[PDB]
C-alpha cells in the first residue's frame, strides 16, 4: 500500500484468502473489519507514527468509541479489494477514521466505513479530550475540507442506539476471549466484539439474509479474565438491537444495531 | 504465488499484518498455520483442484488431516515478507503428505518447516479408507517422484508416537467453544482452532519467558459447532516440554493429543 499523491489518504490492495471467507464463499464482516484496521495501521506508519510525540509524553492513547460499516457486496475468495482510508479532526471531542472499499477490477464501491475515536489516559482510562498542542501535530496529515465516507445530512452512522431491555429474544452466553483474540498490547481487539454481537443472531437469519449494516458503540473494554453475554432482539429487511454485557454483574461493554437484506 | 519451474511445488510470499502478531511483535503460530493452509489451498487451485480429485468427488471421498507437525526457528516480525514453498507426496495406500518450508524473503534463510499426514475419508459416513489406484494415478502427476522431505532426519520428531495424558492434568482450560469465525466455508471447525485450544492450557508464565519451537498434533475426531472442549496440559521435562489433550467437556471423548517444545527467550 501507499499514500496517495497529495499525502492526505492511504490506499492498499488485499487478495481475499481461503480462510477469510464464510459459508457463502465471500469475506466475512470479521475479515473486512481486520482489513480496515490493517489499512489504518499502515496509514499511521507511513506518516510517522497511532500516538503523537506529546501523546506518548502524557501517556494518552486513541480509543475507538464508535464503528459503523456498510457493505453492498462482499468480496469473493481470490478477488482483490482496494481500501482507501483517511483521518479527520472533529474538534476537541476527538478524531474520525473513514474507509472506502472498492472492487479492484470494476472500480465500483462495494462498501464504506466510519469510526469515532476519543483520547484517554492509558493508565487511569479517563477521557482527557483533545488539546490544541495535540491537534496541529496530526492536522497536517488530514484533509482540510470535510471528506466524509457517509456525507448525507443525518445518515445511519450518527444514529442514537438505545439499551436492550430484558428479556432478550436471542442470546449467546459464556463468551470468553482467547490468546488469539488479543493484540500485541494484550487488549481484546475491536473485531472480537463484532463477532460476539453476531453470535446471538439466529442461524436462520444467517442462512437466508446477508449483513448490510452494522453500527457498534464501545462503552467499556473486556479483559482476558472477563466473560461476555451477547443479547439480541428483532426490532422490525430484518433489523436487530444488540447488547454485550459482563456475564456476572451485567456491566455494559457494547450496544449496536444490524440491518440484514434477503438473499 | 506461483508454481515453480518444474510444476512440482508452489511458492507464495506473505507480508505479516498488524493483527497477525502477538505480544512479542512477531507472527503467532495460529497465523503461521493459517498461512500454511492458504499456500496449500492455492497450490491445489493452480493444479486443477477445488483438494478432491475427479474420482474422489464421484465417490464422496475427501482428504482429512490426521497429523500436523510445525517447527519454527524464527517467527517473522510485523511487516516482514515470508516465503512459503509447499509440495504434496503420495505415501502409497496410507494417504498423502503435505510439506512446507518457510523462509525470510530478504536473507533467504530457513525460519521454519512443517509436515502433515492426510488420509482419505467418506464425507458422509466419516469412514476412513485406503487410497485406491484410480485416485493415486490422478495426483502422482503433481508430486515429485523422488522423496522430498521437509524433515529428512533418521530420528525426526514428526514421526514420534504421542501417548494419552492421564488425569489429573497439571494445567487446564475448561469450556472452550467454537464461534462462527472458527468455521470454514463448509461449516467445519478450522484445524488452526485446535492449535489455539491446545495452547490455551499453557500457563502464562511459560508464554512470557519462552517461545514455542515445536508443536506436533494428532487429529482423532472433529469438534462440532454444538460441542464443548476441555484443554489439558502436563509438563514432561533449558527447554520446556508439555503433553496435551483435547476432549469433549461432557463424556470426555478424545478429539486431539499433542506435544509442545518451548525454548527460553
Ligand atoms: O459463515 C458465515 O456466513 C458467518 C461467519 C461469521 C459470522 O459472524 C456470521 Cl453471522 C456468519
Ligand atoms: O500473543 C501471544 O504471545 C500468544 C498468542 C496466541 C497463543 O496461542 C499464544 Cl500461546 C500466545
SS (H, E, C) B28-64: CHHHHHHHHHHHHHHHHHHCCCCCCCHHHHHCCEEEE
Rounded to whole angstroms, the Cα distance separating B147 from A106 reads 45
**Joined grid coordinates for residue B29:** 503460530
Measured CA to CA, the distance from residue B175 to residue B177 in angstroms comes to: 6
Helix axes A190-199, A29-45, angle to 10 degrees: 170
Which residues 59-78 on chain A approach chain B with CB closer than 8 angstroms?
77
Whether B202 is in the pocket of ligand 2, judged by its Cβ within 6 Å, is: yes
Alpha-carbon gap, residue A220 to A77, rounded angstroms: 34
Residues of A in Cβ contact (< 8 Å) with B185 = 18, 21-25, 77
Which residue in A has a C-alpha nearest to residue B44's C-alpha? A18
- Of the residues B186, B190, B191, B238, only one is catalytic, namely B186
Residues 6+ apart with CB under 8 A from B233: B165, B169, B170, B171, B172, B198, B201, B202, B242, B243, B244, B245
Q: Which residues contact A177 (CB under 8 A, 6 or more apart)?
A: A188, A192, A222, A224, A226
Instruction: Please enumerate in sequence order all residues whose Cβ is within 8 A of that of B168, keeping only pairs 6 or more positions apart, or say none.
Output: none
Q: Which CATH class is domain A170-262?
A: alpha beta
Residues of A in contact with B176 (CB under 8 A): 178
Q: Give the experimental resolution in Å.
A: 2.1
> Measured between beta carbons, which residues in chain A are less than 8 angstroms from residue B38?
17-19
Helix, strand, coil shares of chain B, percent, nearest 5, are 20, 40, 40
CB B184 within 8 A of CB B163: no
Q: How buried is residue B19: exposed, middle or buried, by Cβ count under 10 Å (0-12/13-18/19+)? A: middle
Q: Do B179 and A191 touch (CB under 8 A)?
A: no
C-alpha cell at A38: 490493517
> Between B191-200 and B29-46, two packed helices, what is the crossing angle to 10 degrees?
170
Between CA A118 and CA A130 the distance in angstroms is 8
- Looking at ligand 1, which residue's alpha carbon is closest to its atom 9? B180
* Residue spans in chain A of domains classed CATH 3.10.129.10: 2-153, 170-262
CA–CA distance, A213 with A157 (Å, rounded to integer): 10
B183 Cα to the center of ligand 1, angstroms:
9
Question: Is B180 within 8 Å of chain A by CB?
Answer: yes
Q: For residue B176, give the chain A residue with the closest CA.
A: A176
Site to probe by mutation for ligand 1, drawn from A33, A206, A232 as the one with most ligand atoms within 8 Å of Cβ, is: A206
State the distance from the centre of ligand 2 to the C-alpha of A204, rounded, in angstroms: 34
User: In which residue ranges of chain B is CATH 3.10.129.10 found?
Assistant: 2-159, 171-264
The Cα–Cα gap between B71 and B200 comes to: 19
CATH class of B171-264: alpha beta
Among the bound ligands, the one closest to the CA of B21: 2
> Which chain A residues are Cβ-neighbours of B231 within 8 angstroms?
none
Q: In angstroms, what is the span from residue A183 Cα to ligand 2's centroid?
A: 10
Residues contacting residue B225 through CB under 8 Å, at least 6 positions apart = B178, B183, B187, B189
Please state, in angstroms and as integers, the Cα–Cα distance from residue B243 to each residue in A27, A39, A253, B233, B238, following that order: 36, 39, 37, 6, 17
Residue A226 makes CB contacts below 8 A (sequence gap 6+) with A176, A177, A246, A247
Query: What phi, psi does B213 have (nearest 5°)?
Result: -105, -45
**A105 lies within 8 A of chain B by CB:** no
Kindly indicate whether the domain formed by A2-153 is annotated with CATH number 3.10.129.10. Answer: yes
Q: Is some CB atom of chain A closer than 8 A to the CB atom of B34?
A: yes
Residues of chain A with a following break (C to N over 2.5 Å) = 49, 236
Stated as kind and residue range, the H or E segment containing B99 is strand B96-104
Q: Which helix (H) or strand (E) holds A194?
A: helix A190-199
* CA nearest neighbour of B159 among B197, B199, B115: B115
Q: Which of B30, B180, B190 sits opposite A199 (nearest CB)?
A: B180
Interface probe for A, chosen from B12, B179, B192, B193 (most Cβ of A below 10 Å), is B179
Interatomic CA distance for residues A218 and A231, integer angstroms = 15
The experimental technique behind this entry is: X-ray
Yes or no: domain B2-159 corresponds to CATH 3.10.129.10: yes
Record: contact A178-B184, CB cut-off 8 A? no
* Residue whose C-alpha cell reads 482467547 in the numeric block: A178
Amino acid at each position: 500500500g501507499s499514500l496517495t499523491e497529495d499525502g492526505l489518504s492511504y490506499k492498499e490492495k488485499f487478495v481475499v484468502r481461503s480462510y477469510e471467507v464464510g459459508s457463502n464463499k465471500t469475506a466475512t464482516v470479521e475479515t473486512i473489519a481486520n482489513l480496515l484496521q490493517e489499512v489504518g495501521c499502515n496509514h499511521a506508519q507511513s506518516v510517522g507514527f497511532a500516538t503523537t510525540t506529546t501523546m506518548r509524553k502524557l501517556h494518552l492513547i486513541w480509543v475507538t468509541a464508535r464503528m459503523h460499516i456498510e457493505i453492498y457486496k462482499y468480496p469473493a475468495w481470490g478477488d482483490v479489494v482496494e481500501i482507501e482510508t483517511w483521518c479527520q479532526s472533529e474538534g476537541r471531542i476527538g478524531t474520525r477514521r473513514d474507509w472506502i472499499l472498492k472492487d479492484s477490477v470494476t472500480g465500483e464501491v462495494t462498501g464504506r466505513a466510519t469510526s469515532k475515536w476519543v483520547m484517554m489516559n492509558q493508565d487511569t482510562r479517563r477521557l482527557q479530550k483533545v488539546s490544541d498542542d495535540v491537534r496541529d501535530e496530526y492536522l497536517v496529515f488530514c484533509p482540510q475540507e470535510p471528506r466524509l465516507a457517509f456525507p448525507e445530512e443525518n445518515n445511519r452512522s450518527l444514529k442514537k442506539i438505545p439499551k436492550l431491555e430484558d428479556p432478550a429474544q436471542y442470546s449467546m452466553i459464556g463468551l470468553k476471549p482467547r490468546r488469539a483474540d488479543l493484540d500485541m498490547n494484550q487488549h481484546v481487539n475491536n473485531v472480537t466484539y463484532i463477532g460476539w454481537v453476531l453470535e446471538s443472531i439466529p442461524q436462520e437469519i444467517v442462512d437466508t439474509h446477508e449483513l448490510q449494516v452494522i453500527t457498534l458503540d464501545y462503552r467499556r473494554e473486556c479483559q482476558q479474565d472477563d466473560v461476555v453475554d451477547s443479547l439480541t432482539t428483532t426490532t422490525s429487511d430484518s433489523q436487530f438491537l444488540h447488547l454485550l454485557r459482563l456475564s456476572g454483574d451485567g456491566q455494559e461493554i457494547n450496544r449496536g444495531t444490524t440491518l440484514w437484506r434477503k438473499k
